[PDB]
Amino acid sequence: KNFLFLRLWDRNMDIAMGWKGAQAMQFGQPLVFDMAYENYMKRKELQNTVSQLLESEGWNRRNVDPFHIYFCNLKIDGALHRELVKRYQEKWDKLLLTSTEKSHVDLFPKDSIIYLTADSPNVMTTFRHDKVYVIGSFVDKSMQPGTSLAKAKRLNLATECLPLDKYLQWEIGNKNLTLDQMIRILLCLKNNGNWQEALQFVPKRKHTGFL
Amino acid sequence: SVKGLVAVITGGASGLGLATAERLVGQGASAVLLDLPNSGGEAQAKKLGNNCVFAPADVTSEKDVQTALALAKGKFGRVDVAVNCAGIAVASKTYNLKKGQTHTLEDFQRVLDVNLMGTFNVIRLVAGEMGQNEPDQGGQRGVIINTASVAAFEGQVGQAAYSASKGGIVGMTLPIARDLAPIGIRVMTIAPGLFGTPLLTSLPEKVCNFLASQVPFPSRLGDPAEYAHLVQAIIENPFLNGEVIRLDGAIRMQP
Amino acid sequence: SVKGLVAVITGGASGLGLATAERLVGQGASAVLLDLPNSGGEAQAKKLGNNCVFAPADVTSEKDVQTALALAKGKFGRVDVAVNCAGIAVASKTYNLKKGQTHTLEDFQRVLDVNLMGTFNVIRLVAGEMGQNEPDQGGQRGVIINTASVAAFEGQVGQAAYSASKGGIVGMTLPIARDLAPIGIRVMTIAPGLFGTPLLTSLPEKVCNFLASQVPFPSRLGDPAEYAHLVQAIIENPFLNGEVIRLDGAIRMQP
Amino acid sequence: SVKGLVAVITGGASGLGLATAERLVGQGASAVLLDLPNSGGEAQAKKLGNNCVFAPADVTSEKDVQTALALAKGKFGRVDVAVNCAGIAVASKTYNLKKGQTHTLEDFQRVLDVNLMGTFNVIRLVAGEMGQNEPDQGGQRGVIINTASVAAFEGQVGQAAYSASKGGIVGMTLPIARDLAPIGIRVMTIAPGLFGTPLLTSLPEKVCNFLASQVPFPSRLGDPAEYAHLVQAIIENPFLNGEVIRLDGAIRMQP
Amino acid sequence: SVKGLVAVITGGASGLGLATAERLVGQGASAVLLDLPNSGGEAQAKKLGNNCVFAPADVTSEKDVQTALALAKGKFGRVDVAVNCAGIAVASKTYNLKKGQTHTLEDFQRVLDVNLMGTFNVIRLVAGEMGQNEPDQGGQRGVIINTASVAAFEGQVGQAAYSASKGGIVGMTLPIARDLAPIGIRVMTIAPGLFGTPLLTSLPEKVCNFLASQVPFPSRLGDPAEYAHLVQAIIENPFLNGEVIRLDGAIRMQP
RNA sequence: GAAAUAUGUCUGAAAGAGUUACUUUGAUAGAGUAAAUAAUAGGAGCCCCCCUUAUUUC
Ligand SMILES: NC(=O)c1ccc[n+]([C@@H]2O[C@H](COP(=O)([O-])OP(=O)(O)OC[C@H]3O[C@@H](n4cnc5c(N)ncnc54)[C@H](O)[C@@H]3O)[C@@H](O)[C@H]2O)c1
Ligand SMILES: NC(=O)c1ccc[n+]([C@@H]2O[C@H](COP(=O)([O-])OP(=O)(O)OC[C@H]3O[C@@H](n4cnc5c(N)ncnc54)[C@H](O)[C@@H]3O)[C@@H](O)[C@H]2O)c1
Ligand SMILES: NC(=O)c1ccc[n+]([C@@H]2O[C@H](COP(=O)([O-])OP(=O)(O)OC[C@H]3O[C@@H](n4cnc5c(N)ncnc54)[C@H](O)[C@@H]3O)[C@@H](O)[C@H]2O)c1
Ligand SMILES: NC(=O)c1ccc[n+]([C@@H]2O[C@H](COP(=O)([O-])OP(=O)(O)OC[C@H]3O[C@@H](n4cnc5c(N)ncnc54)[C@H](O)[C@@H]3O)[C@@H](O)[C@H]2O)c1
Ligand SMILES: Nc1ncnc2c1ncn2[C@@H]1O[C@H](CSCC[C@H](N)C(=O)O)[C@@H](O)[C@H]1O
């Protein structure tokens, strides 16, 4: 038949995602992954954490309005950075995200930072487009409740949690969600999506249905 | 409106030409689909109604286009508009170092013959057939609407021949707009971007979703009805001449 | 169909703006002639009818445009379209060696302020109002049609400031079409050629007749009704975005 | 050969202007860096040699440009070239619905005044000095080379004001090329793409690296020495006039 | 510098190609004049020196260009630059109502084949030949410089086929630049205006004087030496790619 | 003092759909090469009950 374009769609898709991420780095909304929980995580916990960060940044890279992901407090010599570099390889220096050793409090006004943690009492009414959301990268196999909060309060930041029960019938399950799930939820809320659509990324085993 | 206007539409059995013919016939005009014999355009002409006729022709052939124009004149006695929507596409790299593969000359030649030589052949013959029209109030005897592509400006990899033909159309839009100005014929060109026609819809749905996302706004593949609407707007406006209109939704084709 | 659409037309008390307002109001749309207090646009608003109102504003001033937009929102509740037709023309050579006269920076600054700065100010202040709207079936929240000139492509002698402002509009059509693409606001531009309107009163009558004879086809000054027709066609078509359309009649301005 | 010429380079204390001054002085010509007093161009004038001098002036102020041109004439008694490279860049979205933030008009006015109004002020005030020159054997009295951007053709998101100013420069290139044609001054524009100069200090490092990787070939940030080389080539070619040259490396920007 | 480079110049036996060959060989390069067997190019190749060799080839024929490039490799061992200066012109109106005369399709096809198809054939074969070259310090394996005309942008009456071919070259300049970007071949286009070549010298002195008066500056027919200078400047600049340069002296061809 | 479920991408009896990196892809990339995934919250003896961990019924 007659073909208009060469079959080079993967290269073109990656290039377009790069262009969009380059624009987002300038005019996008910051999203922070606070890499400061190296002490708590074990070896396998850190392996997932890195894997979930990879999947999350992949989801945000393909969005229609990508965030500007910040990897704040990412110690250069720590195991988080080591594993991130090992996993990304030559791409770690081409990723369009801000990876910085300075705590998020050093990059944004303290009045525009909300640390997302289920242990917080305040619920996330609506997704605000003038705020920064801090998603503490973590995997709590050995539960240490009030960690992300305790550190959020230590830094003197506001805290919030997703309205999981207000829109779902959780019954029994772990309220904490994987970093990729959280970023997908926040990308669905950032695109005029209602909580019903946003919370569809929760695992089905954790809830019987919506309310 | 366009009531009583007779339009000769090349490539009218599919995609943009078919949409143009549909809109013009539905607005009360007359259409003469001018496509290849095996284009299945007879069914489209039958569906459109009595105001529409089908003439099996090859734009690259002088005799076939002459016969199509003669059929149009016999059926309707007048040609008031021409729409050169007949074209083909070919994607191939000028040279691939890794594969050691070089662009074939036959591909380039046939792309030029269909997209560029056929367009000019139809333009000249329909201009000849439009000189017999009595000038209207404004002295205008007809409107010729070519169809370039945004490639003509920012063609991608592997779009050398297609971009060459479309750029030729864009370049020759104004010389012919001045050639036929004494006659009163108007020559315009439309450079559509990504449009939802059989040229792209046949691609995998992932590819089509990507192409849709590429458009800044509207974030979707173009609607052939929009091309027909632009063609009608060009037909109605007497002061649109010798210009190329990018109907692409702000998309600048990616490298 | 443009029934019910609310259009804010700047410089709508004269020439192209008034023609656009007349055509839009004549088809059910609402109009807000955003014009200078002394332009006598209130009489034109009264003539047009109740659907049209007059906003005395200077586009170079933020407060005046804000007041006009507030008036439009209060009267009609929406701003579904914007037309930037408010501008001035100044003819002055860059440097005249024989007469030892150098273009005054004041004239250049004034021309830019009225044309380019004014158009950008209107665009930026109406983008908010059009973004508070709710997207229709297709995501659109409005359309903006700027008035560049063919002086932005082939400018004549003693036309440096005018060409600078119009080239600025032409260049910034696409960046602004990409800034507002997420919202759904289309941003088009029209580069009219020679049109019969008060802007040509400065030129000598013999020069005007010569220029009108120089248009390839139709060999006459463009009718403002044709500019209004093109504006309406741009509003109707949802796939025309980030593009400049030369409504000049194929005239290319020689030195 | 460019030996013995005198070139007034605005914004010559940094980036492309400094590279042009370096190349011209090394080739033998004189140089007058017409940069801001706080730009630290005096150090560059000392480093370049006795041929080059530093003229502290603001292109947006007529008196400052007049004083700088008078200083150039006093020191070297001739002005054969004028290189307008003085400009600034601003990245701000026209409207940000999500944040409810609209482009400030002061930013647009600042960018326009610095780039477009400044370039025209320099052009008009140096055309007087270049009109006193005795015409060369070919009839040329001087060359004015403006600096534009590919943003003038396709700007990206948050580039409305910069794109407007550069598009104004591009548009007025030809009108001024025709204004000064009788007195033998050639006006040319250069539209660089991405270059490794302090102007990219605002951009994030990863954004700069990505944009550099996105140049088809050479796939890296442009070298200011290449801009200086093209400026010299324009100076040495008497048949280049009223044209914009995209020195971008084939990169076409995207939103 | 251009010392040692091997340049394949098509249509170098006469006109702009001959001027380019003269300048390149004078600077120390090598030249392969690729023109018609009955063109007198053997005498020019003998005159230029041992560095210049004439290869009789028809650009529209793949075999002839392959043989010419093989001869170039045998004599000089490589191809470092290509200059597509071969082309013809035709004067013919699309349709003359008074004379009842229609443009011949043979003339359009012949002009297309010689200009656009010939340029593409040479471009692709030269890309194949130059891919084998080892990348230089900047990674560049060669340069390709096409000749367009201002007919591609501002075409005149009775210039449909020439304008179509030059517009095709302008359109394909960027797609081929992106095709060959990974290899390292730079593709550029030059759009000369009026030049004192046999294409114009053979005309009567009256029309030549008129044309010399038409150009705003320099008020003369272009000097082929200036085309050669621009070609050398393009060869020397490593960051000029995928761009069209109008070397026409600010003349905009009137209808 | 007794009872519960308790899948770090999701779904699950192995497996399927997803994730990351590199392939300039001739129309099946509808894919290859390499990362990540092979004790179901942490560990033990042998699916089976044992303590701890986050919830929840008297
Ligand atoms: N589809 C797009 O997105 C797109 C974008 C830009 C430009 N274009 C151009 O728009 C035009 C419209 O085509 P389309 O998109 O509808 O594709 P299409 O294949 O549906 O339409 C092309 C039509 O041309 C006819 N045709 C082909 N060769 C012919 C010949 N030699 N003689 C007579 N008829 C012939 C075909 O039978 C068909 O009816 C084409 O020239 C296309 O290249 C298309
Ligand atoms: N007249 C032509 O043929 C022609 C050709 C090309 C472009 N244009 C452009 O088209 C537009 C239409 O102008 P026209 O031809 O109708 O001339 P016009 O003078 O009739 O229209 C210009 C209008 O702008 C208004 N205006 C000027 N400054 C204003 C300000 N600060 N605030 C508010 N209103 C202001 C005037 O009052 C007037 O109503 C102008 O921008 C003109 O430059 C005109
Ligand atoms: N940097 C790029 O890649 C790029 C691309 C396209 C265009 N440009 C244009 O090239 C020009 C050179 O910029 P650059 O890249 O060298 O960055 P730069 O900041 O080094 O150059 C700007 C220069 O202009 C001077 N300047 C600024 N405002 C001035 C004023 N009001 N009066 C006098 N001097 C003033 C500055 O002191 C500085 O020397 C700018 O006009 C820029 O817009 C640059
Ligand atoms: N003369 C101008 O002012 C002007 C302006 C714009 C563009 N051009 C283009 O510049 C180019 C140079 O033309 P010129 O002005 O030197 O005139 P010219 O006639 O001297 O150059 C044409 C050359 O091409 C050769 N040639 C023609 N057909 C050939 C073929 N099939 N195979 C091989 N060689 C062939 C001829 O033998 C001749 O040497 C042409 O392509 C022309 O279209 C010229
Ligand atoms: N229900 C919820 N509400 C808000 N943030 C949540 C959440 N579930 C997960 N997150 C986010 O996802 C991250 C990984 S979950 C790890 C939770 C751990 N207890 C802690 O101290 O944070 C959390 O740190 C938090 O940023």
Numbering used by the authors:
A (entry chain E): 175 to 385
B (entry chain C), C (entry chain B), D (entry chain A), E (entry chain D): 7 to 261
Publication excerpt:
Metazoan mt-RNase P is a multi-enzyme assembly comprising the endonuclease PRORP and a tRNA methyltransferase (MTase) subcomplex composed of the MTase, TRMT10C, and the dehydrogenase, SDR5C1. The architecture of the maturation complexes is globally the same in all structures, i.e. TRMT10C asymmetrically straddles a tetramer of SDR5C1, while wrapping around the pre-tRNA. Our structures show that the TRMT10C/SDR5C1 complex can be a scaffold that presents mitochondrial pre-tRNAs as substrates for chemical modification, i.e. methylation, and nucleolytic cleavages at defined 5′ and 3′ sites and, finally 3′-CCA addition.
Methylation assays, using 3H-SAM as methyl donor, showed that the TRMT10C/SDR5C1 complex methylates both pre-tRNAIle and pre-tRNAHis-Ser. Single-particle cryo-EM data collection and processing yielded EM density maps at an overall resolution of 3.2 Å for the TRMT10C/SDR5C1/pre-tRNAIle complex, 2.7 Å for TRMT10C/SDR5C1/pre-tRNAHis-Ser/PRORP, 2.8 Å for TRMT10C/SDR5C1/pre-tRNAHis(0,Ser)/ELAC2 and 3.1 Å for TRMT10C/SDR5C1/tRNAIle /TRNT1. The density maps for the N-terminal domain (NTD) of TRMT10C were defined only for complexes where a maturation enzyme is bound on the pre-tRNA. In all the structures, the TRMT10C catalytic pocket contains SAH and the flipped-out substrate base: nucleotide A9 of pre-tRNAHis-Ser and nucleotide G9 of pre-tRNAIle. On the opposite side of purine-9, N348 and N350 interact with O6 and N7 of G9. The transferrable methyl group of SAM is located 3.0 Å from the N1 atom of A9 and 1.7 Å from G9 in the TRMT10C active site.
